[PDB]
Ligand binder design. Sequence first.
Ligand code: SF4
Ligand code: SF4
Lengths: 387, 389
Amino acid sequence: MDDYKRILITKILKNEVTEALGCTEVGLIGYAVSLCNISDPFSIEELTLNNGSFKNAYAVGVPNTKKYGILPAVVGGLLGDHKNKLLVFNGIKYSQKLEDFIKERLKIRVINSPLYCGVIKDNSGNTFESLIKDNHLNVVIPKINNSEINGSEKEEYKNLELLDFLEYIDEIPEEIIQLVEKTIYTNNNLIKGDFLNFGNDCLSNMVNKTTSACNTRMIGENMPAMSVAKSGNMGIMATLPIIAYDYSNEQNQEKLIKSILLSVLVTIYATYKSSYLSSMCGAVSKGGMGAVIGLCYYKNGKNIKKLDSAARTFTANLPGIICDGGKVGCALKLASGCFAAYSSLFVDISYENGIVGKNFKECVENISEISKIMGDLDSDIVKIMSK
Amino acid sequence: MDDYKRILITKILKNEVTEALGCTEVGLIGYAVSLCNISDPFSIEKIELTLNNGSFKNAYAVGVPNTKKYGILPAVVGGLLGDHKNKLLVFNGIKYSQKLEDFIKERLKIRVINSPLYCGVKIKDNSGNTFESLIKDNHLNVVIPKINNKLNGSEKEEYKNLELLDFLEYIDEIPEEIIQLVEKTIYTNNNLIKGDFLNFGNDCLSNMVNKTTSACNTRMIGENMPAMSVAKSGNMGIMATLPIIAYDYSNEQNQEKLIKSILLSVLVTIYATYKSSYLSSMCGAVSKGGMGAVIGLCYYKNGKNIKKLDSAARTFTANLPGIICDGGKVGCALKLASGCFAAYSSLFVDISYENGIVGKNFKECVENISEISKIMGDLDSDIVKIMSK
Ligand code: SF4
Ligand code: SF4
């Protein structure tokens, strides 16, 4: 209908929906290490990360290494090129000898701060330092210019309503339809085998597929994930429950496309609302709100009261949860999210009950404010993991 | 097993496992209001209820018995229509009058404070008379007027130094009094099941979530039915017992096995509560009762297996940590439902200790969970600040 709304939503969809090869933090570490440009990787005789980064990278698989941790990311950066940027681990040939070489020399130190990735000395004596700072991945020392969006457009998207999202998925551009199809493609390709299949009912398949794709993204497979806001697990949480619900129901193409589009709209909105960093698991919360709105739209159509009830039951169900770092166990958390979505399709919770919001907007507002309240917990998380 | 261990375990089980009629916060509010002993409630000009963060949180959206209503204002009306001599049972035998609710709604000015349990009522009437009442610290102690009511640590600390092996050996030589306690617990909690709350199938976990949420919803809406509570947290007891009851209902139908598993669940729940010595806005009921329930479920499925119980604890710790305690509500049941999930998912998945906050065994898992609860702190003030809108 409206013009400014369609163009803003289309632009933000083209912006937020990207492809991230696995965990972004190991990718950033490898990119910084390749920016150090060590000529002979075996000639090395210095990594500084913030609490959240060290947490997320302590037990996550690095692409094309079949290993977990920060040392594989550093070795892959050594064996990578700066021109690949966040895809620094592409085309590499992992050498166990270089891993064993760097293990004795890689001295890592953690700091309490926002995003900070600062790196090495060689046999000759030369020292090469590099730094990547701020929430937006901005290189400060290699100065290699290279996603952002100005605040006015984000603010205009925050001023949208659920009705606007319902109207947008009825007048979808062809580029956005193909984007949704490519998203479903990338995230469905992440399903490899069984990870948590405990039945043949709908929620069984939902949990199975979601946990399998999350585990695939975690174990360091060389398969990209269609991420929203550079959080791949958030995109998995937003898309896969809806995919598996559609698989166990009508097997509808356009219906699933529209439901996932509304899910992504809700996810982008929630991420915009949760403007502050948080140690609360933002991926689970936001992706699950998106997924439950999409599932309610698939079940009841364009029904405002049903979507409000789903958001209320979700807010009452699984609010507040720790983001203890990218891990194989993260899949389990997403599994819980699936539950929180399905349970919200059959339960009504009054607005008075606790932190529950009065509608979709107020639910998202309350969840975002509580995420702001839970605050900086990454310091204590890193202190715990070190033991 | 050792003798001192068995005697301590029996004492602590008979101590923590009590019967709570629930809805204790609205009951406290109604009792404080009834201590004013208002003969004619309709002569009031302004009421001033003062609650602490925790009390206002837990009583904001809980059902009041014999009122069929939710909130603090129904509790205030029920206290006005009650007698102080009824103590916490001010709401028994009452006939709720919508007219008195509509009258008091215009005059009830509630104010929140940052303190331990505090319920102070200050009522004025048309004549000019003022009636004050106050309840401080524990529940049972009214200060205005001065009807005092007083509420060892060595036993708690000795219980903290036990191992899961002690709990496994105790459920093999159980005294008869403790067996009767477990059976009465199962009876009380199965009687709390009233209808369906989240039944979307006839499979095992469907029954688990359904029955658990049904009994929690029954305890929440203000029914005058007692609940077998552990550490006076009824939802904790439901979370610890009912998942095991429902898994046994959908599997082997074994009596002594279910008794032993629920006893181990209660042991693990009490242990987790003892370890989390500091207050937290994190949902302690879900966490502790679910740790008990998942240990009991692992004991029912795989028996006396240390690695199996370790894996269950690891997957549980990785699964659903840090849920909010946003006040006693109908939605609380949903959280408990999630707990069921968090337990069942741990019976078929192993999570390495390297994955995040997970500990190397059960003991370390509980220790990390307790430390994170201690770190999260109060936060209830901001919770009520959010709820007030
Ligand atoms: S818990 Fe959620 S936010 Fe934290 S690492 Fe896992 S997927 Fe990401
Ligand atoms: S939300 Fe959890 S901690 Fe809070 S009252 Fe309900 S069961 Fe207890």
